[model samples]
Target: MKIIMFSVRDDEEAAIREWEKKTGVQVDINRLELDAETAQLTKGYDGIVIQQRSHISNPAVYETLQKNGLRQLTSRTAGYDMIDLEQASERGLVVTNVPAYSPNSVAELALTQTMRLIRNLPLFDARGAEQDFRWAGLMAREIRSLTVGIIGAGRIGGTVARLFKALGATVIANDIVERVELKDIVTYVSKEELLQAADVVTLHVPLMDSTTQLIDADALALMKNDAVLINASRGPVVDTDALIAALQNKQIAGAALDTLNGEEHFFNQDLCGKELPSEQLKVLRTLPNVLITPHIGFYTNKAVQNMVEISLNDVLAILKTGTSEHQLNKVA
Candidate 1:
């Protein structure tokens, strides 16, 4: 069978070829992004595979996919918010995503950033630029002596809890779904308790309705003034303005963000010589306590390989079996 994939990055080419060679499924890796007009090119293909940050809210795009006989839609990334779930459900498209492509990669990044914050590396780095190597009031807190709070203990968050626990840090977590395996490593606690008691708070949830701005001013007020925040997940999880204010007021010690709310305007592109656009980003970059990565938490070879394979496999499964374990939306 054949499938049409949109938005092929350089890293995915090798994985795509491997999948085709192993499964004997033809994947047309088109560099063009999927849109209303591009959707019309899927005729004769079994399904569609894509990776995108922009929302596909237009009904006409779905209309064209359906007209081209595409009954399945698969994303190569963990987040699926960019897709039109209501439209997909109405059209009976088996929407799927690589949910746990490589939780370890993301979890490892969160742990690394948390450690950097705890060790006061960013502050020291800033001071070092001026050749000031004197260690005065900037005493570093040992992670083992601190409590690590993990939010959203799914595949990624649970791994984070385990990683922290292995470092001898007392790990506490808050999630809707509790897993028995995770209980052995993390003490499941309420959001408020985790916020109030933790020395380092890390978010591992997705960007959704209830989760957006989950850590607002009230939540920030609950955290200890000496506590720090780490977000390897989506940006909106913590309100950007509220976080900036918190850092400016020294409400918290520091924070690290791998992705920001308006990162699409700058991340993964060249703007080194050009002036920065977003004021929010400007503030974040200037704060010595705050660290920002261009959403490369899942940028390892294993993660990319899994993303490509899982997406292609899901499309094949949907084409033959009408569904997949990775399916996210309801379909008849």
Candidate 2:
């Protein structure tokens, strides 16, 4: 089977080659170096595997792809919001994503960022650069003394909760469906209770209908006055404008954003002199407490290899038996 691979990073080539060798499947993987323009090169390919953050979910793009004969679609990453699922269904295209590639990588990053904010590392860096090495303002508390709240007790969230538990922190979690195993480790609380009581809150939910703007004004208001909010999940999961208000009003202590809603324009670019268009960027830039990073949550070498290997295996399974057990859209 042939797969048109878009946004194929140079570092991931070895992993892709390894996947083919291990599987012994004659899989033809084509690379597209371009961005959204990669979709234009999809003609005559059986399936297309995309691994980057592309705005392919637009209705117009889906319509064009359907006309160009897109049969099957697969994502090398966990999030599928970048792909239009409804449009894929309408066009009879099978879509699958690597939902549980590596929980440890993301969980650890979220924990690290939370610690960074709480410990005032950014503030310390600024002061140290100016040679103001006095310990007057950069006060930090121990993670053991703080209450940690985890939104979305999925594989990643569960991992973070476990990490917090090991650090001697009281872990509180909330999920769409209850994971009975978390009961033994952390207390599963209602969304409201978790938000209200947590000293440090981290979001791990997917980008979907119920979760769109899940962390809005009301949710921010529910948090502790000096709480630290961490978002390693999808950007739109938190409302950027409302979060700016929360930070400005000091409702929450500060936020660490691994992903920002509508942050595509200037995120990866070196905008030293240029004025960023997004209001979210403007607000986050002016604060010493806020930390904003380009979406690099799952960029670890091991995680990237795992995603590529697992996703290819799924595709190869379908090719050989005309069925893949791990096929995401095959559910009854």
Candidate 3:
């Protein structure tokens, strides 16, 4: 099968090549990036595997793929939010994704961001760079003294919950689907209870219709006055506008966002550059309490390689079995 992968990063090429050799498939590599336009590049492949953070749901791309006789669709990354699954289904295209490739990578990121916020590390970096090493406002609480509320206790959430518990934090969690391993480590709580009781709230849930804006004004209000918020999950998983308001009002203490609501346009662009402007980003940049990252929580080397391998495995399965267990179209 002729497979085309797009928007690959620098260090991930070798791993993807290894998958191609193992699967014995002719895979083409394209680094073509997307903007508001530019969807015509997908018109000449048997199967297209997009690995970008940008939405590839353009009607143009869909029509082009159909014209090219492309029927198989896959995303190298875990999140397939960028793809138009409904459109793919309508076109009779098979869709698959590597969902659990690097749960640990993202889980570790959540913990790391939470610790940084608690320790005031970013403020320290700025002051140190300016040679003003006074530690006046760098008050930090130990993780041991905190109660962490973990939402979604699945692969990623459960990994983080265990790590936080090992660090002596009391862990509370909630999952729509039950996980057996989470029962021993953290107490299961309702959404209200977890938000109200936790000293720190971390989100590891997916971005879907039901979970969009899961953390809004009402949810933020339930959190402790000085609670730290950590989100390594989807950007839209938490309402950015609501979060900004909470931070400005000091309703919640601080936040570290690995992904923001509108991160696609600014992913590789210099945040300080004048090429394009983001109003929410502009407001967020001024807030020292809010640490914004460019969706980098899953960039670990181990994770990247795993994503390539696992995605290829699932792709091979789709080609051979005519069905994929990792098929995104399947309703769970």
Candidate 4:
């Protein structure tokens, strides 16, 4: 079976070559993203594997892909928020994402952000840059004395709780259902209780109608004034406008945003000379207390390998068996 993968990079090439050699698969690679225009390139491939943050809303993309004999559209990333699942479903395409590529990678980044925020490293780094070695107003909080609130207790959140607990932080989590495995390390609590008690509130929820803007103004208001926030989950899980307002008003101490709303267009781009497309991004960049990493949580070595192998394998499995465990939006 023929497969095409877009947005190919040198990092993923190692895995691609290894997978092809190991499985006797002949997969074509393209350096471009699979957009509506690029969908034309998938003329006769049985499946397509892609990873990008750009929105795929045009029905023509799904139509073109299906018409070109594509059966499976698999993603190398966790969130399929960029794709219009409804349109793909209408075209009778099965889509899958690498949800468990490396939960530890995401959880590790959250821990890194939390540590940096607690230590006020950004403020210190700015001072160090100009040789202004003054530590005034930048007192650090020890992690052991902090309460870390995880918004979701899934794989990634469970790891985050474990890491924070290892550092002696009390971890309180709130999810639709609590996992029995995390009971010893995590205290299942109400959202309000976690919000009020946490010294750091880290988000790990999927983006959906109920979770979109979940951390709104009201939710932000519930956080302690000195509490910091870390968002490694999908953008829009926290309200961008409300987050900005919170930082401006000192409602929260600071934030480290690995994912933010409207990042699809510009996150991985080189915009050194160009103006940022989003106004919110401009303000966020100017904020000294805010740390932004252009969505690099799922970018570790192991995570990259898992994403490449899993998505590629899913494309093959779905085509061969007509099913896969990672399939999204499948009706029972």
TM-scores for all candidates? 0.81, 0.78, 0.77, 0.81
Global lDDT of each candidate: 0.88, 0.78, 0.80, 0.88
Full-model lDDT, candidate 1: 0.88
**Which residue ranges in model 2 land beyond 4 Å of their true spot?**
1-7, 25-74, 78-96, 269-274, 325-332
lDDT winner between 2 and 3, please give it.
3
Deviation from truth (RMSD, Å), model 4: 3.9
| Model 3 Cα lDDT, one tens digit per residue, 1-332 | 66777777789888988877877787777677643254566655566677777777576666666666666678877678877787777666678888777677888888888888788888898889999999996788988899899898878889999999999889999778777777778889899999999988999887899899999999998888888899888889988899899989999988988898778778768656465466888898888778877888888888999877777677677667768778878312
Candidate 3 vs 4: which has more TM-score: 4
Candidate 1 Cα misplacement greater than 4 A, ranges:
1-4, 26-28, 35-48, 53-73, 78-95, 272-277, 326-332
Itemize residue pairs with steric clashes in candidate 1.
Answer: none
Candidate 3 local lDDT, residue 110: 88
True-vs-predicted CA distance for residue 45, candidate 4, Å: 7.3
lDDT of 4 by residue, 246-287 (tens): 889999999999998999778989999988899999999999
